[PDB]
Structure formats: structure tokens, C-alpha cells
Design a protein around this ligand. Structure first.
Ligand SMILES: Nc1ccn([C@@H]2O[C@H](COP(=O)(O)OP(=O)(O)OP(=O)(O)O)[C@@H](O)[C@H]2O)c(=O)n1
Ligand SMILES: Nc1ccn([C@@H]2O[C@H](COP(=O)(O)OP(=O)(O)OP(=O)(O)O)[C@@H](O)[C@H]2O)c(=O)n1
Ligand SMILES: Nc1ccn([C@@H]2O[C@H](COP(=O)(O)OP(=O)(O)OP(=O)(O)O)[C@@H](O)[C@H]2O)c(=O)n1
Ligand SMILES: Nc1ccn([C@@H]2O[C@H](COP(=O)(O)OP(=O)(O)OP(=O)(O)O)[C@@H](O)[C@H]2O)c(=O)n1
Ligand SMILES: Nc1ccn([C@@H]2O[C@H](COP(=O)(O)OP(=O)(O)OP(=O)(O)O)[C@@H](O)[C@H]2O)c(=O)n1
Ligand SMILES: Nc1ccn([C@@H]2O[C@H](COP(=O)(O)OP(=O)(O)OP(=O)(O)O)[C@@H](O)[C@H]2O)c(=O)n1
Ligand SMILES: [Mg+2]
Ligand SMILES: [Mg+2]
Ligand SMILES: [Mg+2]
Ligand SMILES: [Mg+2]
Ligand SMILES: [Mg+2]
Ligand SMILES: [Mg+2]
Lengths: 559, 559, 559, 186
């Protein structure tokens, strides 16, 4: 086993999550079975209690574990599947050892937070890094730990102590620390004193740093690096600069130009880890897929405009997984992406009574879009705008994907505007009216990776061509409310055909509309399973249809 | 070159100076040409300005450099000769670089204390550790640096930075840090939190510790060591305990039982230093001289009482070199020492008018003494008591040594009480009277190691037998005032014979009185040149005469 | 993790089991949490099917796993508790992977013995060496693997391949091979060609040796070692000699004189394993307990004669654990042991009709004994001799221990000879007679470590003093047949008091007879739990009573 | 006998209770102390030498059980004095007030089916729980001061108001137990 801990910061907004998700990617190019752990200093047990307004979207794992965003960034960069244990939190570990007290397992000793709770952290990291994460049950070679918060805090405090002991309870040369740090620029001069005042605290809290990964606004001066290597004890080759480049998928290749694999190969003796040619050649091939997709980003010019239609579009992190899946689908089509933020409530005609500028800008963005996405919203208060965009996408022939709530407004749209029931309703919203035309029903939660089976006649469905025509699809779910299955025999007659269903047959999970270029609902969330070299099939479908050449993508899949 | 820095402390009174003077002694048993450097955070250039009341005696070097006490402890433990450069001070290095500014040598740059002054420290330590110190001009193998003050101060601050750079400007494995530390005991429990709050500051200021040398009141518990080795990163074998033992000459052998040579041989790769058999066998022989003299201390019982007669005897550190030279002379005679502190002014008959108890206790201690010492006092205000003790020592036949002022009160005593001039006077005191019977004259200072030549007829003199009958003696001086040379032809006629003189003949430096068992004045200071295995010949004379067997010591010397 | 594999041999009778049980002991003196694995090339799943005539006694583990003898040697040398998984066998691993085939887990591939079965071995060794074995659930630092059979066989073949891959699937410097070997002596010359013809095969089968542990009849010549170090690639310091010495408890200290800890500390980098002072000081203290008990064996002279009374005494390995527990008890009493082999059937009066010499020699040995043991026999055909020895031990006051069957013949003896039922019988033997005076009943098996609770009045019982007066005893069991609990109220009235019982109260597990110096039955097996520094309390009782000073042992326990 | 925990020292605590009863020395049993006093009195005055702490010797299932489990009972609880109690030195120390409020801990309590025997033999249960079914104080008739309290009297003592059973013990041991009973009741 080996560990690399990514850590530090003068400030908590500094962006450690790319250097974690990008260090682990570079180590995966050596062919190593890499894994990752997030530490979050917040008290939440797991993210399911905190709304998407409050620091971004509610992620989903194979377990159903509603979790921190930063798990998702490692899953999509590293190709790995994570579990709800990979998110260490102050909530979890304190709830764990305090529940263990009432169980009695410390034999009625004191449960001081030094010794015993820092021992539970060091045990949890050693459990979790041995859980398998790739397509086979082989245990990881290297674990990337992202230490949330900063080193020099009061929510960080048990973790930085636990990791001082863990620098020895796992031997040095099986552990390395990467310290992210701030180097401000003021009046044209690079200021390395915030960094030198977090190297003092790092040595004090007891870890010793290996890298000094500065988030400067610039290239670091040769004299700036020379002084950071005088005040921190690292050699000047190790003072990596992580400055902005044309997209975040380039960041691994900047770190590779900055020798970071050659340093980590030495500093963790990675030549002593046992690897097969099936490991190593997969490693060096994955490097060439990353060099190819970044070269394709560097000279892709032909734009594709996708309208993302929903509430809270000013909080873009409320959709981080939706955005990132369109970026994967974009780079695979070799069309450059623009996403058009349509704040759905502005499409509703009553907006014309409040501000006409909003009514025109939103319908302008929607009309300009080469493809349309209803992105699995939350709450109900924007729903009429999401219905109008689904009417537009059906009648104007524009490519369409409905995710989760998106499948459900598509059924509501089709009921109101093709089946001809204008009172038909989201039972998710208009409940205590008790009306008969209910497009949905509550069936109290359903979460995690679940099996979707294709219905028998489905051969013609573009969505089934995009899934490689395989009879079952494994994808991640969230929904309380599902389509009322007593309308399905009507929709099945009117050309709205339910391509895919749950294994009991009673629950509807995919539809495709007959006789449209690409119009799909998926009631699972296709966002979360997308990887940077394997875009999620419904999202690859949307960005292909909107680019043209949907047929040529269907060959690239099925060959 | 190799360095061991002795450092640290929660508190500055903790006693680092033995662990320095005793680490260097253990390394000298490997045969290495060891040297030592004192750092003193005080602003004094050199100790000549600060009176013996204010933190102890005014030392003297071969240069005449009036210096910190702690040079003396290394000289006598290590056998080495030091120079006034071996005392780094905040006074010296700031006076040096600020005088260098007016000379211009920084080419008109800023002389920031980071970079440039910490570079002058790192240059000074590298100059000084290459100065020769043994009986031949061979440069040192290892240098012990004693960092005065504490690590975690404001007078320490440039030194701890300079030594962080010096951990690299000289490579690791040529440098090691020994951190002395406090482990209080309260209500019967050993408290290792003062130590853990100086390991935090040490890592912060940037040095990394190797040893954790606790000054506990006890043996450290196995659980106390195990926790210090959990919070400091040292292994538990390295947490040396430096507790009190029957005399400070045992301390090296406690550190040798605690593996400290075996650790330093590894941690500085001392097997790679080139040594001859003339080095190595001198090393292992010196170890057996230390094992022998400590075994002799362990079962020597026969006491010898020496009266030390002078002012300020409540400030025993005002005489630290005098005390230590009697301890060497004691252990060489194999008699256990008691020193009788005679506060000289109490011997004066006017004390009987003020407090009779003082007059009796002081004359009781003087009468009880097996030998008498006038210890080179300072000022003049106790002089009549020192004259009465010299009258007593001459008439009652008791063994006597006068050092510096001691030779001078012996001439004043002999003038008043044998030559018969009762008005004869210390010109050092009774100056503006302008009287003719002046026993002294001013000749403005005279300092350092100087040559004393024996006068021709001297063959019979016990002091010349103790110096091995060699024609010239090299010893360290301090005196403004010297014997008036126009009385010498009278004293030479009356049996007070000046055994030794300055090379010009005009200055008188040793006398021995004819027809007394042992009665000597030396106007140089014999204290400073004594080593733990080579006691200063006049002091070996005194403690031998007082023990009996002065003749048997004269064979041990001359064989 | 670290591994040392003990292996090799020109011949299979060469005695590898001491070098395994003695290498692991030397590593435990560094304080390392050592464990051990036995590989047995035989096809038996576990030893319960093979009778004690056929290669020695039927061992018992905490699991109830009836197992190979060689587990016992590591348990008693290393203080460890093992589990039935620590005995790898050709039976087990082939039964495992062939049962796994019918379960389907190789996904319908071929299950070649290369790749897949050698992968199951390498998985099993990596599972098993992480199971905890000491008094706390901490996973082992080093694992000793004893490779049964020889390297160069057809029953060895999958293991030597699995261990060639395991030399890499665990890195070199986490693995070392010790090759035991034969160096015959013929016409006075040491013959190192059998050894050189097993170093050829070792290199061929692909492991590389580290040690060459010769079982010569002599000290190896300096020229013999020099040639073995020319033909094997080891340096001559590594060619350890394992010749006979005054008892097998000396063998670790011969290997310690032959540098084997200093070599294994280097060759596995054991300084890089994390140890506490509670580990290290327990390590160096256990070394002094081994130096003390071997020094006590070197000058203990006062004999104690213990009669071991049972069938098959010509097959001494049928009692190996019984013998070894008396040796521990002996060395703890500081009396030298003689065991008197009484072939029990010879005590029966009908032997006088067959051979009087057998009848006299057996009663002579029994009468000569200072103490008597009925050693948990098997079958029934010697039982009348074991009853006569129990009559003798009760009436002649001689110290007595009955183990398992020994407790049961003691109840049968007491019934026939004190309660006065001469027809009372072992229901284990005389079954289909259906008589009413049944001293036993079948209750179909009961195995492994079980809880024995002391009955309330038990305070006076010497056996309860030997167990430290603790209310519950944890010890290993085997019995189909147990004392008929409907006789107990009679025996409890006649002074045969059942000191200890099963937690239900219904089963009787210890008795002590009132008013005899030491007369005990234990229906569990006290042999198996004895360690070389912690002799089994009933056996320490017997060898103490027979030595005299049973009271002084009761202080050594309870202080 | 200071309200111990576990059971492994209990025979020593019984011998000290035998000594304190027969040698007339002043005695206080707190919690477990009341319980070993009942066990002592059963073995050494009532004459059942097999009588036992059911807190220890449980799965023997014997009939002379001096205690029973009744799963926890904690905090400040009301103790009511039994009617005839006027003569009891412990009731004089509580100011003769009919109810006492003090802090409890006990899983195991005296088996209430022995009480009618002890009440006949001069071991009188001065105080009980409000249901009457649980026994909380005893005082032995005809001894200078010999008390069991099954609550813990330690915790309620203040530096200017010492806990009445403990003021009783240190007064009896000092002599002048009567003079303390005036200092209380005046
Ligand atoms: N490989 C990555 C990593 C991060 N991000 C972006 O980074 C964001 C949040 O910043 P991040 O780098 O994850 O760190 P912070 O949120 O600043 O938090 P912290 O510094 O506490 O880790 C999101 O907007 C996400 O789009 C990204 O696009 N690609
Ligand atoms: N740890 C430090 C670093 C610098 N200085 C002193 O502080 C002065 C001003 O600090 P500055 O020159 O700004 O040093 P930087 O570390 O570069 O600060 P910044 O990065 O903000 O420019 C320096 O000339 C130097 O003498 C100091 O006392 N302690
Ligand atoms: N080998 C030694 C070293 C020190 N001392 C004694 O130690 C004294 C002063 O304490 P020291 O150990 O030199 O250190 P501190 O004065 O406490 O100062 P610091 O801790 O700042 O180094 C003197 O009284 C001297 O007699 C001694 O006798 N022998
Ligand atoms: N660096 C540390 C050390 C200890 N503790 C906590 O503080 C409590 C009280 O400290 P203490 O137990 O006294 O630890 P020591 O370091 O031994 O303090 P001392 O040496 O003074 O006894 C401990 O139980 C532990 O939970 C802490 O928060 N931070
Ligand atoms: N520490 C040890 C090890 C072994 N033996 C003795 O060794 C025996 C059997 O030989 P062993 O050394 O265990 O090995 P072998 O039986 O020869 O088998 P192999 O060589 O196949 O391992 C038993 O008689 C046992 O008494 C012993 O007394 N003490
Ligand atoms: N691997 C070897 C070893 C030896 N020889 C030759 O065989 C001769 C006889 O073998 P021997 O001298 O007996 O060598 P040893 O290995 O010592 O045989 P042994 O140990 O049985 O004495 C040697 O002189 C040598 O020339 C050989 O051919 N191949
Ligand atoms: Mg903030
Ligand atoms: Mg982040
Ligand atoms: Mg001070
Ligand atoms: Mg000092
Ligand atoms: Mg055979
Ligand atoms: Mg064997």
C-alpha cells in the first residue's frame, strides 16, 4: 500500500480537488490500481440532508450514499467506483466513535480524542483504501487522500493529528504529502509569505511536506521558486505551479511537464509495486487517450449549443455532474461546447407580465439551442417552463434529453399536448386536489445503482443503439415519484414507447418518442456514471444529435 | 566535517552545558578530533565588561579573550584549547555585520537579517569549526554547537533560522540535533506536555530533533518514553534521561549506558571519518582513564578540607573554575573533597564588634581546614581577612596556595608580619596616600597565555617539582597590579624566593616560601588550564599537601 | 508484512520444525508480533481422521480444529494462539479450489493448477498471516512459513511454485528463505554433496536461498562452510549449524550466537517495522526469561520421576504435548525431569500369567515414581492398568493428575474402591451390557477452547490456588463420554469434590480429592495450552507436588 | 464498608462485618456494605452458612439468596422510615423526620423474603421505599452504632452539612454520639 495526501492551503477556496483528481490520474498512467478518499471537516453524516443551493448538487454512489461533490471528480477522472465510506467526515467519525462508546468497545476507558479517535481515523483510512474500486476485485496500489478544510484550523484538528501518527503507523516511503498553497500577486510582485505561514503551521501540526503546489495568478518566477525552496525544505524542482489552462482536463499534463510522476515514482519507490503488462500497457494506453482527447480539445472549433432548462441556474454547482457529462460528450463528438442557461420560470407566459426582457432572453436562448436538456431538477416551482421547453423540443424536432424530473415533465407535456388532458398534473406538486389524471405516483425513496431491462420490441430505439444493444443497463437512481404506470398503455399506443423498465416490469425507466431525431427520457440519473474517456450514453446521444452525425457515433460505439 | 547541535528547553535554566560537554567527551572516546562552539544570545561582545556577581566568573582564553563560563566546561572535559571566536554572541555577530555595512561589503544592497546575517552565522560556524584545538594543528572531525537561550525565543531567532539553513548548507548526515527538554513531576505523575510544546516549536522554527534529552527528577517511566516517542518522531531508544548522579563526571557514562555513542556513530556515519590507530587507541585509552577516575570517585572516602578564603562566597559561580580545579586535584589524590567557604571579611577583628557568630564560624572553618586557598579575588573590600588567613597559613604551617590576588596578599602579609613594615599596603587599594612601602604597582592590562621562566637556583622548590622541573611554564594571566619589584631583593634574602618570573626578568610570577610543607603564590591563574585528566600543577600540589603524600604525587608526575 | 519461509531438505526426517519454532522465537525477542503457518503436503483435510499411532498425537486448537503436531511447537515456543486455517494442506487447498469449481467462481474458465491454484495458495498465506494471534487483536509483523515435505518432490510441487510467485507478489526484502539441509559424515569426512544437490533443485524450482541450515552430526569445519558458500551463493557467516545441545530449548540461543537475528534484521529491514517500547521491552524481557530458564536447565540436578501410565508408550509422539508440558513444569520447579513410561496393561494381574518380568518392571517404575499421570489415552484396552495406578495413587498418597480419560478412570477407581460398586464400569467400553452402575455417559463430540467455572465452596482446592483463584478457566477440550452426573452427589459426599463444571452446571470438568497432598482430575486437556514460559497450571501442580515445595509454587503464582 | 464494585473482595468485607458486630466497633455499610451486612448476619447469626450474594453466586440457583436483581435504579429517591423506628440512632441523626431524600445506585437489593426473620432477630429495617417492598436502611438493636444504608450517603454531604450516617460513624468512633444528637435536634 502507498498514500499521497493532498492538503494545506492558506485559504479553503484554493482548489485542491483538481490536484487530487489529477495526481491520481497521473499515477493511473503508471498502470497502478489507484483509489481516493475525501476528508470533509463538516459535521454532516452524508450530503442527503443539505439542499443543492448550499454548496452544490446532491451526488449519488452505487450504495445509494448521497455524498460530497468531490467523490464525483475522482470517479470521473480515475474511472473508479466509490462507496459511501470513502467520504470521511467530522460527522461520521465522531458519530462512529461516540456510538461505539454506548456499545462499550473501549472497555470502559476514557475515550480521549487523542489516542482513541485519531486511532479510529487511522483504522478507517486503512480499511477504506483496501476496498476494491475497479472492474475486478483487486485491492488498490496507491490511495490519494484529499484533506478538506485547511491544515491550521479547528475542524481539521483530529485529522492533522491522525495523519501525523499515520506518517509512521504506515512507514515513510509509503506516505507523501502534497501541500497546496497561496502565492498572492500585489503591485506586480509574487508574495510567498502566506505560503511560508502555512509551512510553519504544517511542521508545527507535525506532517512534513513533499510538494508545494502554488495557486498563483501567473507562472512562478525562478527567484520565487528559489525562495519557497529556501523557506520550505523541498528542492526547487518540486515547487509545482498549477496555473489556469484552456480546460481542467489539461491539468494532469501540466503536472506531467512539471516532473510530478518522475518525482512520485522516486519518493514512493513505485518501481517496487508489482505490475503486470496488462496493468502497465493499460496505463500507457490511457495516457495516449488523455493526450488524444486534450489534443482534440486544442483544435475543436465547431460549436454545439445545448440548452440546460431548469431552476437555480445561477447556482451552476447545483448541476456540476450535468455540466461535466456534457463536456465528456462534447470532446467525444469533437464539437466545442456552449451550454445555454435557461432559468425555466422565465419561459412561462406570466413572466411577460413581470419582465418582458426575461421572457425574450430565455426563449431566445432556448430557440438558439442545437439541443435541449431537462436536467433532473429539485422542488417544483419552475415546472411550467420545463413543460414548455418539452413542447418546443417535441414539435420543433430539436434533440432532447429528460433526466429524472425531465422524463416526468416529458410525460406531463405529452399528456397535456398530445393525449389531450390539459388538467393532467405532477402528483409531485398538485397532490391534495385528488384529481384522476395523475401523471406520477409516490412509490418513500429509491437510491443507488439499479438494473434497467429493455422492453422486448426496443430494437429500433436510438437509446438502445447507444447502450450497445445490451439487454440490461446499470445506472444510478434517485426518485420518490415515478410515472403512473396506468397511463403507459396509452403512451405505448401514441408512439411514446417505454424502451426500458425495472426488473418487476411495473416501473418505467426509459422512453424514446417514435419518429423524432433524438427525444429521450431517462428516470435514472445518467450524469454520475460518465467518465472522462467514457461519456454517459444518453448524454453522448444528445451532444451527437445536436452536432449532427448521430449515426457515425452509433458506429463508433458498436464497432 | 560533522556537527552535533545541543539545543532546546522549555526553560533556560535546564542545564544543557553538561549534555554538550559530555556528548563531546563521548565522541572523543571514538578518537575523533572533537571541537565545540558556544552560542550566547546576550548582547555582550565578550564577558570582560560583566562583573563576577552577574552570572559567574570572568573566564580567560589563550588569546586573552575574557569569555563565557561555558567555554571552560568544554576545555576541561575535552582537553581542547579554545579561542575567543568559539563564543558566538548576539553582540558579536550583529557588531560584525553592522561594522561590515560601514565597510561596504554587501555592495550597497539591503542587509536584511534573513539571507545576509543568517549567512554570516553559517559562515562563522564553518570558519570556527576548522580552527585547530588539540596539541597539533589538525582540523576537527566533529563540532558540538551549544545553542544558548531556548529554541522558541526572540534572542534565539536568527540562530534557529541560521541553523535551519545550516541543516542543508551542510548536508544532513553531517548534522544532528539534540533537544534538551523539561518533563515536570506533579502529584507523582511525569508530565511530558512542556516537552511536546517545545517539539511543536522546534518543527515550526524548522530544525528536526534526533534526541530528546529529558531533565526529569526521576527515571523516565517506560510509558513516559513511549508517549514522548509518539509525539516526537524519535524512536524510544533515543529519549535519553539525564538525571542526577554522584558527581557530574559520571554523566558521560550514563549517556554511554543509554547507547548515545552507538546512536551518534550511526546517525552521523562516524565510521566513514578517517582515523589512525594513534587516534583510536588514544580514544579507547581515554575512555579507560574516565572509567578509572569515576571508579576512584565511587569508593574514595578519606576527606580533605580546603578553605577557600575570599569575598562573595555566596556566589559560588564567581569561582566555578577554582572549584572545578580542586575537584580534578581531589580525584587525582584519591581523597574526597570538602571546600570550606570562608567569607574573608568575617576573619577581620572588627567583625567581633558586629556579629561574634560570623567571627567564630569563619575562624572555625579556617582552623578546621587541611589546606588553604586565596582564590584570585576581585575588588579590594575583603583584603584584611585574606591577609589574616595568609598569616595563619605561614605561622601554623598549613598548606597554602595564593592565586593572582592571593600571591599579592601573601607579599603584603609577609611584609607586615616578617619584614616588619605594618604600614605596607596594596597599591591596588590605598593609592592616593602616596606612601613609600608599596607592595604592588600598576604595570593598563595583561591577559592570555604567557611564558613563565624559572629563576636559576629553583631546583629545591616543590612547585618546580610539580611542573616536572621543566624550565618554562605556559599558563593564563590576568593582572593590572603586580608585585613592586624593588622589594624582591629583601624577600629573596628572607626566604620568600621568587621561583618564577616573566622572560624580561622584571616581573614576578611564582614564589615558594623556604622551610614550609607547601606555601606557594602564583600570579597567573592556574585554574583555567586544568583538565579532568590533568589537574593544574599548583592545585594538585595543594590537594596533595593537604591529603599528605605530596612526595608520592611528585613521583607520579616525574616517572 | 514480512515472511520467512523454512524449507528444503535432502531428506524429510531432517527436523525443520525446531528451526521454524526457534527462528520465530528469535524474531519475537525483537518485540515483533510474530505468527507462523505450517504447510503439510499430505492429503488429509485435518488430523482428526488419523489415529495417534500414525505419526503422533491428535492436537486441538481453540476452534476445535484437530491438527498437525507442528502447530503445537509454534504455539508453545511463540506464546501464540493458532486457528485451523494456519495448517495449509494438499487436502485443504485442493478440496477448497475443487469445491470452488462446483460453486463456479472461476467464471467457467479452465482451473489449471498453475495460475489459479497457486494463486489460491498465495491468497491463503496472505489471508492467514493477517489473522491476529496474541492477547490483543493486532495483526502480525512477521510470518514464519514451515514448508512440509521437501523442495524437490511431487507432493511439494504446487507449494514451491506458489512460493516462487510469492517471492514477487510480496516484494523481496519482505520475504526470506531458510533452507535446512543434510551434510553426512562418512569415514570422518563432512560430505556437502547432498546439500549441493538440493541447492541445484531449489534454484531450479525457482526460490533463492538465504540461509543454509545444516543438520550435521558435528560442528561444521571452516573449510566445509567455505565450500558450501562457494556452491551455494550465501556468504560463509550465513551457513548456520543446528547441531544437538543439552535440550531443544537451547536451540534459539545457538542461532543467536550464530548471528541469525543480526542477519534477519538486515535481510528483511526489520528496523523499518513500527514498534512501541511496550513491544520492544517485552521483547528484550522475554529474551532474559529464555536466558534464565536455559541457565536454570544448565545446573538443575535434583531429579523428579513422573510415571506416565497408558497404552502405546513405545510411540512417545502419541503423547508429545504431555511430555512437553511436563518439561515446562520441570524447568519452572528447577527440578530435572525423568518420565517413567508405564505401559499400563502390564500393571494388570493377568500379565503375571504371560510374563512376570513385564508385571514387575511396570509396578517397579510406578512404585519408583515421585508423581503419577494418567495422560488422556485413546481406545479402552489398557484401562484396568490405569485403574490400578489410580488406586495406588489414592491409597499410597503419591501426587496424581488425570487428564481427560484420566479423570474418568479416577471416578471408576473411586466407585469400585471407595464407594464399593465393583461392577461399576466405563460406559465408554462395557456398553451393551446395559448395567445400572455407569460411571460415564455419551453426551456426539465436544471440541476446542471452552469455559470452566469453579463450583462455589472451592476455595480450599489446590487446583483453584494454581489457577490464581480466578472464577473461570479457559482450556481446550476433547471428549465424547463424560462422568455420569447422577453419581456426583455421592462423590461430593465422600470427599471427591467437583471443583469445576461447565456453565450449565450439568457437566463435570475438574475434581480434587479432599485430604491428599495433590490428587486432581481434569476432563479438558491441560497439555495444549502450556507455553515454554507459562506451564499449564495442573501440570505445574503435579511437578511441584512431586518435587516438594507445592506451597512455594502457590506463592510464585499468587504474588 | 464503602459501596464497592464487582464481587472479588466480598469475603473480606463479610469478615470485617463479623468483627464489627461481635467486637462492638462502630459500623457503616454503604450500598454493597448493607448487603454484606445482611449476608454476614445470615451466615453468622441466623445460621445459614451457604447463604450467598445473588450478585455473585447466581447460576448455582440455591434457596438461601440474600439478594435479588430488581435492570437499574438511580438518582435522588424517597426513603420512608418504618413505623416503630423511634429508638434508632440513624433516625435521631436524620432529625427524626419521617422521609429522607438521598442518591441511589443498585441493581441488586436485599431479598425481601428474609426481612421477617431479620426483623425478629433484632436486625430491624428502619427505612424502606414508598411501596414498602424494598429495604433501604437497617440498624442492629443493642450495638453502639451499626448501620446499613443501601443508598449512597456520600454524595449529598456538604462542607458545612456532613451526611447524617457518616456524621453518625465519625461521632460514634470519637465518642460523644449523644452530644452530636443534641447538636442536630436543637
Ligand atoms: N478537475 C476539476 C476539479 C475542480 N473543478 C471545478 O472546481 C470547483 C470547485 O473548486 P474545487 O477545485 O473543487 O475546490 P474548492 O471548491 O475551492 O474547495 P477546496 O479548496 O476546499 O478543496 C467546481 O466549480 C468544478 O467545476 C473542475 O472543473 N475540474
Ligand atoms: N520569515 C521571514 C521572512 C522575511 N523576514 C524579513 O521580513 C522582511 C520583509 O519580508 P519580505 O521581504 O516581504 O519577505 P517575503 O517572505 O517575500 O514576503 P512576501 O512574500 O509577502 O513578499 C524581509 O526583508 C526579511 O528581512 C522575516 O523577518 N521573517
Ligand atoms: N559538566 C558540568 C556542567 C555544568 N555544571 C554546573 O552547571 C552550572 C550551571 O548550569 P549549566 O548546566 O551550565 O546550565 P545553566 O546555567 O542552567 O544554563 P543553560 O541551561 O542556559 O545552558 C554550574 O553551577 C556548574 O557547576 C557542572 O558542574 N559540570
Ligand atoms: N497534544 C495533545 C495531547 C493531549 N491532548 C488531550 O488532552 C488530554 C489531557 O492531556 P494529558 O492527558 O495530560 O496529556 P499529556 O501530554 O500527558 O499531558 P501531561 O504530560 O501534562 O500529563 C488528553 O487525554 C488528550 O485527549 C490533546 O488534545 N492534545
Ligand atoms: N522445538 C522442538 C522441535 C522438535 N522437537 C522434536 O522433534 C520431533 C519430530 O521432528 P521435527 O523436528 O518436528 O521434524 P520431523 O518430524 O523430522 O519432520 P520434518 O523434517 O518433515 O519437518 C518430536 O519428536 C519433538 O519431540 C522438539 O522436541 N522440540
Ligand atoms: N558439483 C560438483 C562438485 C564436485 N565435482 C568434482 O567431483 C569430485 C569429487 O567430488 P568431491 O570431491 O567429493 O566434492 P564434494 O562436493 O565435497 O562431495 P562430498 O561433499 O560428498 O565430499 C571433485 O574433486 C570435483 O572435481 C563436480 O564435478 N561437480
Ligand atoms: Mg469560507
Ligand atoms: Mg473542493
Ligand atoms: Mg531567567
Ligand atoms: Mg549553561
Ligand atoms: Mg519417509
Ligand atoms: Mg516436523
Amino acid at each position: 500500500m502507498k498514500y499521497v495526501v493532498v492538503s494545506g492551503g492558506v485559504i479553503s477556496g484554493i482548489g485542491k480537488g483538481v490536484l487530487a483528481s489529477s495526481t491520481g490520474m497521473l499515477l493511473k498512467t503508471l498502470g497502478l490500481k489507484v483509489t481516493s478518499i475525501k476528508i470533509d471537516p463538516y459535521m454532516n453524516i452524508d450530503a442527503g440532508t443539505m439542499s443543492p443551493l448550499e454548496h452544490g448538487e446532491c451526488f449519488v454512489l452505487d450504495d445509494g450514499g448521497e455524498t460530497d461533490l468531490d467523490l464525483g471528480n475522482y470517479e470521473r477522472y480515475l474511472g473508479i467506483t466509490l462507496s459511501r465510506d470513502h467520504n470521511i467526515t467530522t460527522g461520521k467519525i465522531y458519530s462512529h466513535v461516540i456510538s461505539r462508546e454506548r456499545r462499550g468497545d473501549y472497555l470502559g476507558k476514557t475515550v480521549q480524542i487523542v489516542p482513541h479517535l485519531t486511532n479510529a481515523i487511522q483504522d478507517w483510512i486503512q480499511r477504506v483504501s483496501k476496498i476494491p474500486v475497479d472492474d475486478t476485485g483487486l485491492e488498490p496500489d496507491v490511495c490519494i487522500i484529499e484533506l478538506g478544510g485547511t491544515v491550521g484550523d479547528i475542524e481539521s484538528a483530529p485529522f492533522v493529528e491522525a495523519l501525523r501518527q499515520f506518517q509512521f503507523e504506515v512507514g515513510r516511503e509509503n506516505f507523501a504529502l502534497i501541500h497546496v498553497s497561496l502565492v498572492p500577486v500585489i503591485h506586480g510582485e509574487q508574495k510567498t509569505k502566506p505560503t511560508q505561514a502555512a509551512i510553519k503551521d504544517l511542521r508545527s501540526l507535525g506532517l512534513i511536506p513533499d510538494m508545494i503546489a502554488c495557486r498563483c495568478s501567473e507562472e512562478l518566477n525562478r527567484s520565487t521558486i528559489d525562495k519557497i525552496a529556501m523557506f520550505c525544505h523541498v528542492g526547487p524542482e518540486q515547487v509545482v505551479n498549477v496555473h489556469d489552462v484552456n480546460s481542467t482536463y489539461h491539468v494532469p499534463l501540466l503536472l506531467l511537464k512539471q516532473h510530478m510522476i518522475d518525482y512520485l515514482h522516486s519518493r514512493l519507490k513505485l518501481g517496487e509495486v508489482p505490475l503486470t503488462l496488462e496493468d502497465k500497457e493499460r496505463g500507457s494506453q490511457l495516457l495516449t487517450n488523455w493526450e488524444n482527447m486534450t489534443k482534440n480539445l486544442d483544435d475543436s472549433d465547431d460549436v454545439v449549443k445545448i440548452a440546460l432548462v431548469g431552476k437555480y441556474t445561477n447556482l451552476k454547482d447545483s448541476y456540476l455532474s450535468v455540466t461535466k457529462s456534457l463536456e465528456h460528450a462534447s470532446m467525444k463528438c469533437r464539437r466545442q461546447l456552449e451550454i445555454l442557461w435557461v432559468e425555466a420560470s422565465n419561459l412561462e407566459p406570466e413572466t411577460q407580465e413581470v419582465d418582458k426582457n426575461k421572457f425574450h432572453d430565455s426563449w431566445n436562448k432556448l430557440s438558439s439551442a442545437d439541443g435541449i436538456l431537462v436536467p433532473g431538477g429539485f422542488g417544483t416551482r419552475g415546472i411550467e417552463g420545463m413543460i414548455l421547453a418539452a413542447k418546443w423540443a417535441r414539435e420543433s424536432g430539436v434533440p432532447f434529453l429528460g433526466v429524472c424530473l425531465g422524463l416526468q415533465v416529458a410525460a406531463i407535456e405529452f399528456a397535456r399536448n398530445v393525449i389531450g388532458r390539459p388538467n393532467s398534473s405532477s402528483t409531485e406538486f398538485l397532490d391534495e386536489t385528488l384529481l384522476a389524471p395523475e401523471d406520477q405516483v409516490v412509490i418513500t425513496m429509491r437510491l443507488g445503482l439499479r438494473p434497467t431491462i429493455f422492453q422486448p420490441n426496443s430494437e429500433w430505439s436510438n437509446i438502445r443503439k447507444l447502450y450497445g444493444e445490451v439487454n440490461e443497463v446499470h445506472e444510478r437512481h434517485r426518485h420518490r415519484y415515478e410515472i403512473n404506470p396506468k397511463i403507459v398503455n396509452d403512451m405505448e399506443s401514441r408512439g411514446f414507447i417505454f424502451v426500458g423498465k425495472d426488473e418487476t416490469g411495473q416501473r418505467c425507466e426509459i422512453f424514446e418518442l417514435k419518429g423524432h431525431p433524438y427525444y429521450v427520457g431517462t428516470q435514472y440519473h445518467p450524469e454520475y456514471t460518465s467518465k472522462v474517456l467514457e461519456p454517459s450514453r444518453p448524454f453522448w446521444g444528445l451532444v451527437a444529435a445536436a452536432s449532427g452525425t448521430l449515426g457515425e457515433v452509433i458506429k463508433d460505439i458498436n464497432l
